[PDB]
Amino acid sequence: SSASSTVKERSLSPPKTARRELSSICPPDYDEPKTPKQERPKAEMMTLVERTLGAPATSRPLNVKSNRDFISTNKAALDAGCVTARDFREFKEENYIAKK
Amino acid sequence: MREVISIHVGQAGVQIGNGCWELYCLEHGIQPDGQLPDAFNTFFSETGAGKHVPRAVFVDLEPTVVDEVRTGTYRQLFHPEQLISGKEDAANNYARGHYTVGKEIIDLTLDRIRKLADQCTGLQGFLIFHSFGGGTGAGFGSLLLERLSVDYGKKSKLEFTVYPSPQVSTAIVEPYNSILATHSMIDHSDCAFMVDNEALYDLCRRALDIERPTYTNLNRLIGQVVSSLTASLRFDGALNVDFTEFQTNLVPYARIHFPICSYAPVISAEKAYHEQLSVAEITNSLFEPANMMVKCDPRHGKYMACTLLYRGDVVPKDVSAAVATIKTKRTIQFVDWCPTGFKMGINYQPPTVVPGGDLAKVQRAVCMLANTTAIAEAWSRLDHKFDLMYAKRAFVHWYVGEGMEEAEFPEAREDLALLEKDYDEVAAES
Amino acid sequence: MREVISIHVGQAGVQIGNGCWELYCLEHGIQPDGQLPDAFNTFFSETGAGKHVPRAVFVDLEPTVVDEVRTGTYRQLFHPEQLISGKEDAANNYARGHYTVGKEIIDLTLDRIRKLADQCTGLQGFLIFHSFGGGTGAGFGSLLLERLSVDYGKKSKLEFTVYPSPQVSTAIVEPYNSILATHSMIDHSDCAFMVDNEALYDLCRRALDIERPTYTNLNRLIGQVVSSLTASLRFDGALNVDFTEFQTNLVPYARIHFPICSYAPVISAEKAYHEQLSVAEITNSLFEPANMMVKCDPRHGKYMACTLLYRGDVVPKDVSAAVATIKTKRTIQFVDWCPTGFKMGINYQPPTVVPGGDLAKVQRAVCMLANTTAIAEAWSRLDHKFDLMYAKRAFVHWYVGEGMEEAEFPEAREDLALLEKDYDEVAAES
Amino acid sequence: VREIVHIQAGQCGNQIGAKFWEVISDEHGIDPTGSYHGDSDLQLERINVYYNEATGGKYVPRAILVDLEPGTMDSVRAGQFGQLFRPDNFVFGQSGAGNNWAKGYYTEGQELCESILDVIRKEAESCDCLQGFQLVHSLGGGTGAGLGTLLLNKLREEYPDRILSTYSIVPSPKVSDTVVEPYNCTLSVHQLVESADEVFCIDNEALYDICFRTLKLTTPTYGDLNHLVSMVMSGTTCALRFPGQLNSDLRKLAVNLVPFPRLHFFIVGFAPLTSRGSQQYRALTVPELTSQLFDNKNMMAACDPRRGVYLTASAHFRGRMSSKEVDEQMLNIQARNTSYFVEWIPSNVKSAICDIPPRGLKMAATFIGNTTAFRELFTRVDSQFQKMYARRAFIHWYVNEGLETVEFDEARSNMTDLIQEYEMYET
Amino acid sequence: VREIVHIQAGQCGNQIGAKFWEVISDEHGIDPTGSYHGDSDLQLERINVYYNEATGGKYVPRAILVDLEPGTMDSVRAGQFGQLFRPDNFVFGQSGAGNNWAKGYYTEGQELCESILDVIRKEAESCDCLQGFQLVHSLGGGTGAGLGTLLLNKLREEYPDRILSTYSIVPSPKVSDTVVEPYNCTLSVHQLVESADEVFCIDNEALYDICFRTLKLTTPTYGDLNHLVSMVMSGTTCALRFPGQLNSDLRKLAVNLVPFPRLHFFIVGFAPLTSRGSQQYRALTVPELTSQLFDNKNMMAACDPRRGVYLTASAHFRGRMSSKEVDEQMLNIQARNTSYFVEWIPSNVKSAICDIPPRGLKMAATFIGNTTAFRELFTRVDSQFQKMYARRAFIHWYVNEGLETVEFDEARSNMTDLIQEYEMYET
Numbered sequence A: 001s002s003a004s005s006t007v008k009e010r011s012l013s014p015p016k017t018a019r020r021e022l023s024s025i026c027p028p029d030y031d032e033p034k035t036p037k038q039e040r041p042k043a044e045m046m047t048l049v050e051r052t053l054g055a056p057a058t059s060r061p062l063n064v065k066s067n068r069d070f071i072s073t074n075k076a077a078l079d080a081g082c083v084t085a086r087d088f089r090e091f092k093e094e095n096y097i098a099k100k
Numbered sequence B, C: 001m002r003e004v005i006s007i008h009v010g011q012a013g014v015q016i017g018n019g020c021w022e023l024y025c026l027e028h029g030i031q032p033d034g035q036l037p038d039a040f041n042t043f044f045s046e047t048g049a050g051k052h053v054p055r056a057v058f059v060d061l062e063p064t065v066v067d068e069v070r071t072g073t074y075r076q077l078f079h080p081e082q083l084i085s086g087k088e089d090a091a092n093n094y095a096r097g098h099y100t101v102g103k104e105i106i107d108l109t110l111d112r113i114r115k116l117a118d119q120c121t122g123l124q125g126f127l128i129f130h131s132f133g134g135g136t137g138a139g140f141g142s143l144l145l146e147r148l149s150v151d152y153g154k155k156s157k158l159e160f161t162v163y164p165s166p167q168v169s170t171a172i173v174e175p176y177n178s179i180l181a182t183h184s185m186i187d188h189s190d191c192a193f194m195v196d197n198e199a200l201y202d203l204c205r206r207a208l209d210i211e212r213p214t215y216t217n218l219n220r221l222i223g224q225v226v227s228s229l230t231a232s233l234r235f236d237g238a239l240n241v242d243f244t245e246f247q248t249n250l251v252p253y254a255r256i257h258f259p260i261c262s263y264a265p266v267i268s269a270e271k272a273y274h275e276q277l278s279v280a281e282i283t284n285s286l287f288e289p290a291n292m293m294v295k296c297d298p299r300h301g302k303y304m305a306c307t308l309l310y311r312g313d314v315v316p317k318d319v320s321a322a323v324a325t326i327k328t329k330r331t332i333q334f335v336d337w338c339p340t341g342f343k344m345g346i347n348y349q350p351p352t353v354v355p356g357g358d359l360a361k362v363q364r365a366v367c368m369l370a371n372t373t374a375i376a377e378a379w380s381r382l383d384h385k386f387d388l389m390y391a392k393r394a395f396v397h398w399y400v401g402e403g404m405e406e407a408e409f410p411e412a413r414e415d416l417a418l419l420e421k422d423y424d425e426v427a428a429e430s
Numbered sequence D, E: 001v002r003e004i005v006h007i008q009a010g011q012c013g014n015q016i017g018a019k020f021w022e023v024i025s026d027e028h029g030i031d032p033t034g035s036y037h038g039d040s041d042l043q044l045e046r047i048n049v050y051y052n053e054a055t056g057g058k059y060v061p062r063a064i065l066v067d068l069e070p071g072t073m074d075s076v077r078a079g080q081f082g083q084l085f086r087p088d089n090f091v092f093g094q095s096g097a098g099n100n101w102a103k104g105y106y107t108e109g110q111e112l113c114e115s116i117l118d119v120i121r122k123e124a125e126s127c128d129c130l131q132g133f134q135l136v137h138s139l140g141g142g143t144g145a146g147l148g149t150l151l152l153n154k155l156r157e158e159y160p161d162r163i164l165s166t167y168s169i170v171p172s173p174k175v176s177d178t179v180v181e182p183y184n185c186t187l188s189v190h191q192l193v194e195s196a197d198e199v200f201c202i203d204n205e206a207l208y209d210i211c212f213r214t215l216k217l218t219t220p221t222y223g224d225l226n227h228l229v230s231m232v233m234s235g236t237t238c239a240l241r242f243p244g245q246l247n248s249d250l251r252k253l254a255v256n257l258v259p260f261p262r263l264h265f266f267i268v269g270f271a272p273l274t275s276r277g278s279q280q281y282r283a284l285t286v287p288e289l290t291s292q293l294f295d296n297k298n299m300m301a302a303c304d305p306r307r308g309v310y311l312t313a314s315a316h317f318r319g320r321m322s323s324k325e326v327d328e329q330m331l332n333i334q335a336r337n338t339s340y341f342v343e344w345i346p347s348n349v350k351s352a353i354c355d356i357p358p359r360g361l362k363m364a365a366t367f368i369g370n371t372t373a374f375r376e377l378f379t380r381v382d383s384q385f386q387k388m389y390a391r392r393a394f395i396h397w398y399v400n401e402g403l404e405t406v407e408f409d410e411a412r413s414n415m416t417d418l419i420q421e422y423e424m425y426e427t
């Protein structure tokens, strides 16, 4: 209706001989066939009913650390002959013993 | 291989075929020129040098309809033999197109059909389109089927006809052509599908996003049903249905040969993106009276046959869920002697769309064919229309001079009455 | 998983629904386009890809109100089939909206509601909104309940209507619509809640800090009450209450369903900064005669039903102390027939605030649903108003000329009289 | 060894069951993923009692979850210990029960009963020796009461020999959550009197009172309220799960406490209960446990036993203790309280000792007893039932489900007989 | 050594047989190009049972494909394992099957019968140790219902001593894929009763029921259904191909299960069946297999044995298991369920053990039995056929091919005799 009016409108859509035309928004022209299925065949449970018994059931280890046993460290420090506090730490800082 | 042949008589039949061969060319990926930029053997013949030819012959008594294809973009595909046309139409007269003019060109049509039959290794049926109200469609089709019945005998003869609308009528002498043609089909046709224009107009106005459609829109909807029907043979499927399997399941009686057609989903260009279109949803949409291609209420009768063909993304498991849910509906009545009721077929090919088309682009669609007593209501309207004008003998002299013997009119009238009595008797539980 | 469905009739119902679905989208985090930037299945359905749809249908006899939603920003979320618009309204005439015009479209609406319920597996309940003064709301509501009662049988039918105000009114023929509507819902409705605009205006002015409210602010208050009721069905809680629980608890008989509602706190977004509003604080505010949204005197109204839905932040011990403290008050007299008289719902979900809104950002809130004999006060006012006009036969000719029989007026008058007699009998001690 | 099958009904049953299996997993030392990460071989002696063993070193608890709506089911699935339960054990309907006892019994109980019974039989015949069933339910009306009593009868039909020990949370008789409680409670008691063996009554108000008085919780949360009930539950079965100096199973408790078939309702209590701060200063000994157990504020049933009289009393202990100290304390309390015991039953107090105490506490105890103080609870609900039946309010919902009011009269007649039986047995 | 010949007389059987040969190739380790690429020498022990060896190491199955239209063969030839079949072992007509029993048996049946019997003689005469014939067909179709019985009659005339064991798919009770199936099953059974030695009945709806309940397949395809059928079929012949401590060949299974010549219809079932995610929760043991085998939710036929009584039944176990528990479990299941068995046959059940279980399972079992519950299946088609009797008009479609109406009366009298036969053996 450009011969009488300046038109920029959506709701009151005029018809056209071939088809009514769009008011909402749409994805690309040809695209989107609707609501696909999904499938999971019999074979996978054949595999899992065996392999569930296998390795993937292995438990997790512990992230241990080499924390010093200070008492045994002092035993070795005394045995080596470290007397002064600074030299005591030097042996205590370097030559660890991890706790049993 | 296995082959099908398509024959068209009348303006409507050819224009419906024009839509169908568009749909098939795109579906298989065949350019209009016949070259490629599969399963061609089901409908096409590989002539060598990359060109293909359809298995169809067009015959119209006037050249206007056929000249449209001759001057159109379609011309490079069809063999010039397959574009037969006369120079004088029957002009809405059954007697004129069956005796005075039909016998002039019927031998030419039969020879070309037989020439096409030589190349069909696995010929197992024919597709013929009629316009019941037309003089050319009814008269020439009657002579063609009677001749083809004795030419080949035990071969499936499936028809796709257009019934006159309950109120919309384009021909004044339409019932005269309708009854005489119906009397001739009823003895030869294996099974004739039934559609009407008025139901197509109402469906396209409500469901599809078209306000004032044309004949192109109606033909494309019919063409999709043809493609869905023929998809079982053309492509691999979980449940393939043969043409003869349709013959055994769809018409479980002697002469009851008129089922109705339905198609789902029929949705606009934007509501599909707004909707689930689940297997249960589309199945429920089929049985609702608003979605039928024939304007007859199933609540006036009962069902005795159903055939569902699923094209696309469809698990068989949901198919069993859908049909079981349908049987729970009290609004749908099934006769006692048909406990099975249904034939299902599942094919993996998705629906086909057309550039500048009318439909959505869905991932699953279902074509439905059902034989029911609701079609008996249409016969009552046709019979009453015929009786009113024939009582005053409204158009007898036009037919009589054109080769019609007056004794044939009561014979066809009695034949229609026998059809109505047969339809009513079957609907009675025993 | 577990589902609800809502219908909105009349401009009052549609405009209320507009605000409610605003509230749900912000609560559930859905853009107006239906795409996300759970408990969705209770109210929404996933249409594939990335778009959602609401389980609602909007029906009216005039296109203006429906077209506003079609023109609004939320036009994208709703499905076009859900928006049903009539041609000419009932003109505040119950007979016109029930028989002459209502029957034209009733079959169309009934098809869409039943069709939407097909996707609704875990469904118990419906939400229907009415405008008692308006002809379409009362007239179409009667017919819709009449059809839905027999089509679905034992299903929870719950309604949220706007009761006529004792003095504020906008239609002169309002009493005629209400009595005839009351005669229909008294048999076809499981349980329906009512509020009046006069008390809504008063609460929106005193406790809330709006000098001059519009219908939008009142709708937002109604939406908050609806959101609290449906909170249990969507989120976990220490005490979850289902629809069937509400029906069993609130009513002691068949015809005494009508409850009243209350919501606390209703403090404004500005004044609320000063108060912590503990469990004891909010509990006491509910039972104030001023906090009721129905202008009824609690002194004349004994209590034999109560329901405490807490949203936000609560520990169950604080409820038990708060309920026990409330029971000690002498002014709040329960009936002898109801020692326990309490249902409480503790739900973890805090309330929601709308941008550009009016309510406070309260950490915890409580909604009230109770049945009291004070509602019998409103029936007498409506009964007397009807008697004054019908004494001189004020507007008989309009309803008679629209297909309604004259004798229906004394029938509904006697039906209301029985209701008032039942309320007096039940309120009496024994 | 000697197995027990656990059944959870409705909302209240599942939350308690979730807390109970959390406590049981802590007792035996089972990781929430199913792996055994315990510390004592003694946990493995009778792990078969409550657990089935799945290949791959994983254990599946003997728990069957039952509901009519999936709301509570989803909450348990999202829970911390929801992974332990077998997926097929979850049986649920698609309908909010509505707490109509007639609806929950006839309308929806019957259809779910067939599926639940077969699921129960799956675990029932999967154990070397079943001994008794454990049921947790609330007396609300929808699924815990209606469907619970239906399952109790069907299990009584199936297994006459086995012990049907059920735990019941009676509606709190000052504030409780629905108006239809007296109808549902009266019918539930009617069915529970004949078909159940041991009925344990717990009141929510007493649970609030204990948290305030002894635990000093600022607000008793439903997690901790369920925790105390779970602790009492574990103590009851602890004698079977671990060795002791003087054992006592469920059958021993039933034979000792129950003098006559009908009078078998029990009040429960736990000790030691201490605040989070004052436990450092407490000198926990046998006399301390005795004082807490017989304290009227630690009994989690809100019916003061001092108003009535006692008939039987039982005591359990967990931890390395001297048997003489227990024997002296039980004799000490018995002679002191002679005005609260029947003259015709000497040695009214039973005792038992378990070797291993619960985690965190060096010492623990559990009190279960039978008294005539239950006359108050039945009288209260009878008066409420009498009012509502006199008005015949709320009955239209039950009538629509097919329950005729003559059933209500039969239930009250049984309840009145139970009240009378308690009254004359007090003399 | 102990050879079998497999005939796929129908288009459905060609799809099922295609999946079947995938299963067998997987079990023996046959690469999709026909060359052996297995992992054990035990596979090549009795490979002669099902395969012939061509010069070059390429192994070809003893299979023949039969159909009336070329639709299905194109799918199988393009299939993953279509290469394995012999190029000259494809027999197909050039006409529409038409789903008609009379047309398939008479019109095209006589045309193809001369050729198909000649092609079968290639496999029949080229195996010295032959004991076996295996027919796969559907009863509601057009090429297996009619032409399958035509081949069965001709083969019985040719080789009376060989065992004629056939597998059949029965039309579904609720809805089946074709309108005219009750006629097709009616005509087929008359030939099957006299000619066939062993009949296996499988229902599609029961397969759907098993998939959705146990496997929790939210979208079970045709491949899943065929896999379950292939599992039962492959397990039956396992005794002929692998060592076992208690062998049970086809003749052993026939002698034990068949008490009288006409009562030889068999129901099939396979164990273990578990949800894909719940298998880790299961302690797969022999009692668990016994629970699944006798479970009323695992048979591939929708017929409840509890509505009737049991005739002789058999069970076959694959996998490393000891004997004693198998003997004890079968003894206990017989003593537990006395009412369902018949007293005049002591030791109603039979057991068998095979060493090697199928791939992916450390042990599995196959259940084959016979009972009086089959009468419900015959009642379904009989009740439908009785209303189809008024559609003896519809039978005009059959007489157009050449059939006479008196055949239908002869067939229905045969079911009536068979139904009365089952009823009288119930006593």
Ligand SMILES: Nc1nc2c(ncn2[C@@H]2O[C@H](COP(=O)(O)OP(=O)(O)OP(=O)(O)O)[C@@H](O)[C@H]2O)c(=O)[nH]1
Residues within 6 Å of the ligand: B009, B010, B011, B012, B015, B016, B061, B089, B090, B091, B092, B093, B097, B131, B133, B134, B135, B136, B137, B138, B162, B170, B171, B197, B215, B216, B218, B219
């Ligand atoms: N669905 C559909 N129907 C059509 C179309 N075109 C025509 N028809 C119908 O088919 C009929 C054709 O008959 P006629 O107009 O008589 O043309 P004819 O078949 O050649 O018969 P005569 O020309 O009179 O000899 C018309 O009456 C229409 O109702 C079409 O494009 N689509």
Ligand SMILES: Nc1nc2c(ncn2[C@@H]2O[C@H](COP(=O)(O)OP(=O)(O)OP(=O)(O)O)[C@@H](O)[C@H]2O)c(=O)[nH]1
Residues within 6 Å of the ligand: C009, C010, C011, C012, C015, C016, C089, C090, C091, C092, C093, C097, C131, C132, C133, C134, C135, C136, C137, C138, C162, C170, C171, C197, C215, C216, C218, C219
């Ligand atoms: N609270 C509230 N009430 C409204 C609103 N709009 C209308 N109403 C009520 O609706 C009544 C008027 O009737 P209508 O809303 O027109 O009801 P109707 O179904 O459209 O009936 P008719 O218009 O007469 O055909 C008044 O009494 C108002 O109280 C609204 O936005 N908010």
Ligand SMILES: Nc1nc2c(ncn2[C@@H]2O[C@H](COP(=O)(O)OP(=O)(O)O)[C@@H](O)[C@H]2O)c(=O)[nH]1
Residues within 6 Å of the ligand: C238, D009, D010, D011, D012, D013, D015, D016, D097, D099, D138, D139, D140, D141, D142, D143, D144, D145, D146, D169, D176, D177, D178, D204, D222, D225, D226
């Ligand atoms: N102690 C305790 N009681 C609870 C809890 N949750 C719910 N309840 C109580 O359980 C009752 C509801 O029982 P319900 O499961 O609905 O039984 P049903 O109606 O028969 O199915 C209410 O009265 C609550 O007071 C909890 O976590 N702890």
Ligand SMILES: Nc1nc2c(ncn2[C@@H]2O[C@H](COP(=O)(O)OP(=O)(O)O)[C@@H](O)[C@H]2O)c(=O)[nH]1
Residues within 6 Å of the ligand: B238, E009, E010, E011, E012, E013, E014, E015, E016, E099, E136, E137, E138, E139, E140, E141, E142, E143, E144, E145, E169, E176, E177, E178, E204, E222, E225, E226
């Ligand atoms: N389970 C299963 N059934 C099938 C399959 N293909 C076809 N059928 C069944 O076979 C029936 C059609 O019969 P038909 O194929 O003519 O039998 P046939 O001649 O022996 O192959 C349909 O009703 C289907 O139910 C398949 O792949 N799997």
Ligand SMILES: [Mg+2]
Residues within 6 Å of the ligand: B009, B010, B011, B012, B013, B130, B131, B132, B133, B134, B137
């Ligand atoms: Mg025409």
Ligand SMILES: [Mg+2]
Residues within 6 Å of the ligand: C010, C011, C062, C089, C134, C136
């Ligand atoms: Mg209005």
